[PDB]
């Protein structure tokens, strides 16, 4: 079992006890992100002048 106490800032789970965890924001910037192909579905007449 694990209990997280934000008021006291303690995480206890079994035989471990973390006190005073601090986490900083990461850039979250991954190179070569997805490049989705964007299209438009439209009616094209058979004969166009």
């Amino acid at each position: 079992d694990v209990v997280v106490s934000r008021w006291l800032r303690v995480t206890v789970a079994g035989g471990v006890h973390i006190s005073g965890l601090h986490t900083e924001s990461a850039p979250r910037r991954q190179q070569e992100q997805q490049v989705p192909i964007l299209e438009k579905f439209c009616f094209t007449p058979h004969t166009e002048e």
Partner: protein, 48 residues
């Protein structure tokens, strides 16, 4: 000392005391203040 203080200042409650010999007062204060903590801390203790 707890009993003497309770006798001296009746306004104090059973939730206004904590143990000094150990570091248990941090959890008590944080719990009874909702994690907000206190404003002034008149400190005379050392090390941890």
């Amino acid at each position: 000392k707890r009993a003497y203080l309770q006798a001296r200042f009746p306004q104090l409650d059973s939730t206004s005391f904590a143990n000094s010999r150990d570091t248990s007062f941090e959890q008590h204060v944080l719990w009874h203040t909702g994690g907000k903590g206190v404003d002034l801390v008149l400190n005379s203790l050392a090390e941890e």
